[PDB]
PDB file of C-alpha atoms in Angstrom:
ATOM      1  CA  UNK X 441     113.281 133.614  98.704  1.00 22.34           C
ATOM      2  CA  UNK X 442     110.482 131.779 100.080  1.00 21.11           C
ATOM      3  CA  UNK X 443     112.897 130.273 102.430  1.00 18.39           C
ATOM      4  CA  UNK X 444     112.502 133.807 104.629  1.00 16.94           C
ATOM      5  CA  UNK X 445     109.043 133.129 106.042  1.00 18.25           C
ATOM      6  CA  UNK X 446     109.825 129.278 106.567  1.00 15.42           C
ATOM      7  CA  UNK X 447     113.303 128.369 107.126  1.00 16.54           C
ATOM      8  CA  UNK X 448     112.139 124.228 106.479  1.00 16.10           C
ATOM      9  CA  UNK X 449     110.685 124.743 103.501  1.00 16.26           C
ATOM     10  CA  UNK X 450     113.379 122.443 101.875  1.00 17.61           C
ATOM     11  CA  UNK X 451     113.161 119.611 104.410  1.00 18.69           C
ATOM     12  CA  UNK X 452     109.272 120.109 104.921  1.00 20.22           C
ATOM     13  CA  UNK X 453     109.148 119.445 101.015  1.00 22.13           C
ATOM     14  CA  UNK X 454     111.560 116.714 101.142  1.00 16.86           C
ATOM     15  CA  UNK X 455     108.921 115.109 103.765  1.00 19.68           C
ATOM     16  CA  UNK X 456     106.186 115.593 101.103  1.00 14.79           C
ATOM     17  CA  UNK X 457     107.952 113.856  98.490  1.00 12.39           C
ATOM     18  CA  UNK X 458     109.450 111.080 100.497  1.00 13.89           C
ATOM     19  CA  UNK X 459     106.347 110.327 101.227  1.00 12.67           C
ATOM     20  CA  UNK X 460     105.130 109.932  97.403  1.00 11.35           C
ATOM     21  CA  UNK X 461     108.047 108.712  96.042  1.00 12.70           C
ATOM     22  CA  UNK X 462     106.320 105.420  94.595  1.00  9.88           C
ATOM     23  CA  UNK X 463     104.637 107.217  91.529  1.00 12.34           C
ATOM     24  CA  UNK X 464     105.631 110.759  92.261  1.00 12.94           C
ATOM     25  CA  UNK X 465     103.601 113.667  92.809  1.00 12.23           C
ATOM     26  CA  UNK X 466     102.237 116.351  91.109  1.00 11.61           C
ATOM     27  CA  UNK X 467     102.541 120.525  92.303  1.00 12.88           C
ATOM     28  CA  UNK X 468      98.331 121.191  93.619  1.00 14.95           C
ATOM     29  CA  UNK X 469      98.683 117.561  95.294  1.00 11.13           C
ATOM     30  CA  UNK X 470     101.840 118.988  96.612  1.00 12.21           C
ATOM     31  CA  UNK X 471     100.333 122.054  98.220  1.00 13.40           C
ATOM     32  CA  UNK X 472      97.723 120.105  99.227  1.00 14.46           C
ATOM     33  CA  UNK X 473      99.953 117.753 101.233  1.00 14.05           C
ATOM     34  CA  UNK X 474     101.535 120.815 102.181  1.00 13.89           C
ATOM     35  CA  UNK X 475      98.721 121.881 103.970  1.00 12.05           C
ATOM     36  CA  UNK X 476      97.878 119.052 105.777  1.00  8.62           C
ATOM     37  CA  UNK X 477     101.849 118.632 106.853  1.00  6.62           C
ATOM     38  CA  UNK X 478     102.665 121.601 108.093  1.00  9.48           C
ATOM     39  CA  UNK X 479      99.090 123.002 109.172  1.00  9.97           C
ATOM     40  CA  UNK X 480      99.903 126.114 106.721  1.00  7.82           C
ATOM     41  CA  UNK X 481      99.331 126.555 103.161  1.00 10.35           C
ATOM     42  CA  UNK X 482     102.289 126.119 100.334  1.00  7.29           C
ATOM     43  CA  UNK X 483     103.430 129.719 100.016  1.00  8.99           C
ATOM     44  CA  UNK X 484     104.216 129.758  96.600  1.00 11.05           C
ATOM     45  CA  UNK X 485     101.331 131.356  93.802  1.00 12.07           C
ATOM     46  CA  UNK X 486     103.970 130.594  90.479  1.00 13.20           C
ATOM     47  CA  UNK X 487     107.515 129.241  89.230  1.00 13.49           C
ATOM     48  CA  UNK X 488     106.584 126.709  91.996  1.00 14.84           C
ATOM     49  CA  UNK X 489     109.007 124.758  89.619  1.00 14.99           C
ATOM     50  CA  UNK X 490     111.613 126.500  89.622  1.00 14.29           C
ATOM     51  CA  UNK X 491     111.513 127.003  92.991  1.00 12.81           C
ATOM     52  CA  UNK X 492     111.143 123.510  93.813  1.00 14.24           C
ATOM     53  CA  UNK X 493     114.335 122.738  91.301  1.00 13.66           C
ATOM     54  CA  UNK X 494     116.071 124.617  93.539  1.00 15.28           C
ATOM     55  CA  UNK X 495     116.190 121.607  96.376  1.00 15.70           C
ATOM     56  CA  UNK X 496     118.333 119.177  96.002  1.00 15.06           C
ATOM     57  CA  UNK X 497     117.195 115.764  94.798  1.00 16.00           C
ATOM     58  CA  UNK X 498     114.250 116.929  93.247  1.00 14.00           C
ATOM     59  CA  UNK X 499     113.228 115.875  90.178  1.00 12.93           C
ATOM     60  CA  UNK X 500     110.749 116.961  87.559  1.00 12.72           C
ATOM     61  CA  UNK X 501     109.007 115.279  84.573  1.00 14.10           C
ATOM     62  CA  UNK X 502     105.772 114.972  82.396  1.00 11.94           C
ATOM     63  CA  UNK X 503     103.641 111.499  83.359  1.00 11.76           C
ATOM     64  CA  UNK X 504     101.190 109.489  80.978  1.00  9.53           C
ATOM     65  CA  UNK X 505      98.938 111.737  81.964  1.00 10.47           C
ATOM     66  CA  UNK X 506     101.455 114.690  80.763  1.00 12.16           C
ATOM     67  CA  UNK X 507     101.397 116.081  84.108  1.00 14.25           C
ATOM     68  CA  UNK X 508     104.220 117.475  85.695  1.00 16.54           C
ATOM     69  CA  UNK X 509     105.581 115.711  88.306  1.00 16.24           C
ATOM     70  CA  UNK X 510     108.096 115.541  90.983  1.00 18.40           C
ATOM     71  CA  UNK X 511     110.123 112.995  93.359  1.00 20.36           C
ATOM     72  CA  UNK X 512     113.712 112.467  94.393  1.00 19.16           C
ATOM     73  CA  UNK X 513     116.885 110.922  93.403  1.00 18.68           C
ATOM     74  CA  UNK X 514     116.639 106.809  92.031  1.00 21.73           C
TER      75      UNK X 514
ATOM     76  CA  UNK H1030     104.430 126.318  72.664  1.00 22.34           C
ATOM     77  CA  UNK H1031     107.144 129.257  71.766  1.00 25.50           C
ATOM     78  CA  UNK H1032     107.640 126.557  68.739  1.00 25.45           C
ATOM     79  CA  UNK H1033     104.809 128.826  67.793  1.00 25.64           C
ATOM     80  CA  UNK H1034     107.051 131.204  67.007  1.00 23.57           C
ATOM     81  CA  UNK H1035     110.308 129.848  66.553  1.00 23.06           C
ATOM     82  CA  UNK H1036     109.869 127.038  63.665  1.00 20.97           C
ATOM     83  CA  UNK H1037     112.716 124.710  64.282  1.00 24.39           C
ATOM     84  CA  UNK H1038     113.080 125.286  68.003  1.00 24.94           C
ATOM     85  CA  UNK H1039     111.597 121.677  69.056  1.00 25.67           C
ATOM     86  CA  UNK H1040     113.781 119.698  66.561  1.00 27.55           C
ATOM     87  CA  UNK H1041     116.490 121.460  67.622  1.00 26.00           C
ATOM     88  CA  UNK H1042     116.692 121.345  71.302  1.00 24.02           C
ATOM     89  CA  UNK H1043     115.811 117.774  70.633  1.00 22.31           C
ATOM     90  CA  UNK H1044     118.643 117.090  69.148  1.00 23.83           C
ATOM     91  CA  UNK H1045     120.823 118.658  71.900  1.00 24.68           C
ATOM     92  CA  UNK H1046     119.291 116.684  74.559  1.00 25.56           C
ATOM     93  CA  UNK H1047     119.424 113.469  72.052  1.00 21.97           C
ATOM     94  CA  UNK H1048     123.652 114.160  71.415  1.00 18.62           C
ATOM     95  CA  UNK H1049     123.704 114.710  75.938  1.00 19.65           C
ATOM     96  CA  UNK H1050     121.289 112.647  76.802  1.00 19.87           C
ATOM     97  CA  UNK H1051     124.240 110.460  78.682  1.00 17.05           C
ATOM     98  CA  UNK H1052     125.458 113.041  81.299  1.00 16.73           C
ATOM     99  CA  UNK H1053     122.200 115.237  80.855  1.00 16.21           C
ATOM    100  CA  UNK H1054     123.137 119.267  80.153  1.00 17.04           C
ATOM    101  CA  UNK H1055     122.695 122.272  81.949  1.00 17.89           C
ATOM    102  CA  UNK H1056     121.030 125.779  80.274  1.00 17.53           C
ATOM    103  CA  UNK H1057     123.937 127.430  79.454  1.00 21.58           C
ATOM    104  CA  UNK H1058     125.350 124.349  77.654  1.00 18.68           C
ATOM    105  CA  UNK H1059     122.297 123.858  75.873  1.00 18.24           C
ATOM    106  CA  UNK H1060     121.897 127.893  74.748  1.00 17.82           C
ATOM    107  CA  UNK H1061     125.956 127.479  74.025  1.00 17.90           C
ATOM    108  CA  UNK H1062     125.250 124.760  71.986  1.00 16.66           C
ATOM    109  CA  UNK H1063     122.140 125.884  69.838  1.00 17.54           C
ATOM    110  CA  UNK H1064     124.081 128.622  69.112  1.00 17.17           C
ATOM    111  CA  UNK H1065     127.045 126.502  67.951  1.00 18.52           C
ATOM    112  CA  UNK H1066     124.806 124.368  65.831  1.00 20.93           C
ATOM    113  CA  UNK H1067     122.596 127.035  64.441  1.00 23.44           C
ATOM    114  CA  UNK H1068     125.389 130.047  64.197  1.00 22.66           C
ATOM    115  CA  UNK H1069     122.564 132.008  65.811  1.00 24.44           C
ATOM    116  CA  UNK H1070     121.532 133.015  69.397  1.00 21.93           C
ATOM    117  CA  UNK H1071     119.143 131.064  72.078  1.00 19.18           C
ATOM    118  CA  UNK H1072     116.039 132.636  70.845  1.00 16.56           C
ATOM    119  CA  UNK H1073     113.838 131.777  74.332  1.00 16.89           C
ATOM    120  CA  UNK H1074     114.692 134.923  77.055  1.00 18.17           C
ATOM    121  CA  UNK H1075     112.454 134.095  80.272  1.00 15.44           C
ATOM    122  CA  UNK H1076     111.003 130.884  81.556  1.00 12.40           C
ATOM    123  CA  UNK H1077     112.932 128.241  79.825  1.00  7.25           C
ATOM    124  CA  UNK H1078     112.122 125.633  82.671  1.00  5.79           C
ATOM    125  CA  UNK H1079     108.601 125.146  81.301  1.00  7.79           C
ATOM    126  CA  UNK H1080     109.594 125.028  78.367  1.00  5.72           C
ATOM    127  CA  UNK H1081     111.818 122.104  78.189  1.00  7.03           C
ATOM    128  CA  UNK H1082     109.570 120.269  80.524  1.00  5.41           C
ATOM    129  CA  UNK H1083     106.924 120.221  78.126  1.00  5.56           C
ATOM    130  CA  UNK H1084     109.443 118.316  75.423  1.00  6.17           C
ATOM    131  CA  UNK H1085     108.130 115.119  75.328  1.00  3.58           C
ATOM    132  CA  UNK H1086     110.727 112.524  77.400  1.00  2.00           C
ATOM    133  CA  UNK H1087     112.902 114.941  79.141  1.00  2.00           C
ATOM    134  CA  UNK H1088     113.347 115.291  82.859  1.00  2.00           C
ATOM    135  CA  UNK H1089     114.907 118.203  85.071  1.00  2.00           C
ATOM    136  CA  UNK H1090     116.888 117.522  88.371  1.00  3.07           C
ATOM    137  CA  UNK H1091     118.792 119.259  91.172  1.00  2.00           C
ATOM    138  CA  UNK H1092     122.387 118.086  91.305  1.00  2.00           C
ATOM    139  CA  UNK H1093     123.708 117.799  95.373  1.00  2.00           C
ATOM    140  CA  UNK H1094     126.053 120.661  93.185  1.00  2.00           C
ATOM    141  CA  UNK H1095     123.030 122.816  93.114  1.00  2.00           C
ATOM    142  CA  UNK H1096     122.885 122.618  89.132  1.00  2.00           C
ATOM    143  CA  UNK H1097     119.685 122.333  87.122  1.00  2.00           C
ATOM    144  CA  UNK H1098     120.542 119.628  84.722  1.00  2.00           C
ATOM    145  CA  UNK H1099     118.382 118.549  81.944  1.00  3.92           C
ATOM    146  CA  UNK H1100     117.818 114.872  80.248  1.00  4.92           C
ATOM    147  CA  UNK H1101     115.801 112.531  78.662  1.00  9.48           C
ATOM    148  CA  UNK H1102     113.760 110.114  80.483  1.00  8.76           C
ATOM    149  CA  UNK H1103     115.906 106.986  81.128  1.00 11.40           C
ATOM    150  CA  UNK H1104     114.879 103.591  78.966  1.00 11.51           C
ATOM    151  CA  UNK H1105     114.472 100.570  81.463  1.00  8.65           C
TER     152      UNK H1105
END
């Protein structure tokens, strides 16, 4: 859905997670990195989630912290 | 959480991810299988995601299949 305005979305995301794959990262450090990746804001306002559940690879989980986090495949 | 309303809803999920926790289960399975263990129907309607990712131990992943599989956080 969000894949209409930008078409990398997946592979843009990919990048962002790639690149925190040691301990993960969480969704506002993801828009964040977003940002600061693409030069444009993370589109998504809510179910960033399940949206991001949607690429392949990704995975979600609760840290120490209880935060919800997200990486790739192990 | 929605355990807020539905009393054994925790425990019982719990123990559906506890008998998969091997191959990890999809949604359906899991709302096929309360129902089989309970006789009654999935009580939860929208926004399960959140829910089961705030159950202590379990993690969510996209299979290369596309599938939203659920699980319990692997012991090293």
């Amino acid at each position: 859905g969000s894949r209409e305005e930008y078409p990398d979305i997946d592979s843009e995301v990919r990048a962002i997670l790639l690149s925190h794959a040691q301990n993960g990262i969480t969704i506002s450090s993801i828009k964040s990195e977003y940002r600061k990746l693409t030069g444009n804001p993370f589109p998504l306002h809510d179910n960033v989630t399940d949206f991001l559940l949607t690429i392949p690879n990704v995975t979600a989980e609760c840290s120490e912290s209880g935060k919800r986090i997200f990486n790739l495949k192990a």
